[PDB]
Amino acid sequence: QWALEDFEIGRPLGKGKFGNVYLAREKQSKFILALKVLFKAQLEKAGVEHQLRREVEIQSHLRHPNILRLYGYFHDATRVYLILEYAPLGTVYRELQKLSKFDEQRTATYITELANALSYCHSKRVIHRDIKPENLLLGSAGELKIADFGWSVHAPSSRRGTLDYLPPEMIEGRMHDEKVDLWSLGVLCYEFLVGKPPFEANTYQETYKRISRVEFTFPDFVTEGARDLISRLLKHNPSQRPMLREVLEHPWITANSS
């Protein structure tokens, strides 16, 4: 249906693991969008061509204002192209790099936006599994949009960058469910307030140990309400982590959001 000739290509929006994302405009309608371009040779070498059909099938069926839209896709002799909704205000990653930390009001708003998007995903048994600032994009109003369904699966799953946002069960290569995103949500809340994720380290080895042990500390400026929500989400036991309804009703969230 679609072909590369139907789009004028702009600057790159970001480097991908298997290609690049470009700003682009559909020639007929003048629709601005993001074109995620993946090399067929690189996907085959990694043996992830199946997981790519997964990212497409899962994302194309999600309709929520805090989830990034996938309008379609096509491919040619050497590449696969995913037609994405353009998020004009970039990543939460870049915002965190320039602001160092977010106040409690911005943090709780983002956590509410994420929790609502994740609630919708989990209702379809969808596990995102790659919830991190570089995959959290910003709409025209500054609203958070969950993106990069690259590692998305349906729950339960055993299917096996940094380990920073991964729970203990996904590391170790054990069976997992929707609770992996609740752990990730806790890592995000910490990072938003502190400026760095709680298990950050120099090596993959050291990060693995800290996640395994649930070894982290809060700087003194972290409030009692923030420590409570984070500590609740960062449980080694996935069953002990709260439901998203509980996150949305948490007093610190209701008091600082939105």
Ligand SMILES: Cc1c(C(=O)NS(=O)(=O)N(C)C)cc(-c2ccc(Cl)c(Oc3cnccn3)c2)c2cc[nH]c12
């Ligand atoms: C070789 C090949 C092919 C291939 O059939 N080539 S072809 O026709 O025989 N031909 C060299 C044009 C296809 C893929 C691939 C994987 C996943 C997706 Cl989502 C994808 O996108 C689609 C899939 N269906 C419809 C529309 N877009 C395409 C991959 C991935 C790595 N190598 C591949």
Ligand SMILES: Nc1ncnc2c1ncn2[C@@H]1O[C@H](COP(=O)(O)OP(=O)(O)O)[C@@H](O)[C@H]1O
């Ligand atoms: N729709 C978009 N709008 C704006 N920037 C985007 C968009 N999609 C991706 N980007 C940028 O490109 C980067 C790589 O995209 P992503 O889909 O997460 O690729 P990968 O699967 O390789 O990590 C993002 O982290 C972001 O910086």
Ligand SMILES: O=C(O)[C@@H]1CCCC[C@H]1C(=O)O
């Ligand atoms: O969209 C991609 O770049 C990839 C598709 C295949 C699985 C891994 C995935 C990723 O790195 O997010």
Ligand SMILES: [Cl-]
């Ligand atoms: Cl598979």
Ligand SMILES: [Cl-]
């Ligand atoms: Cl086809």
Ligand SMILES: [Mg+2]
């Ligand atoms: Mg990504």
Ligand SMILES: [Mg+2]
């Ligand atoms: Mg990805």
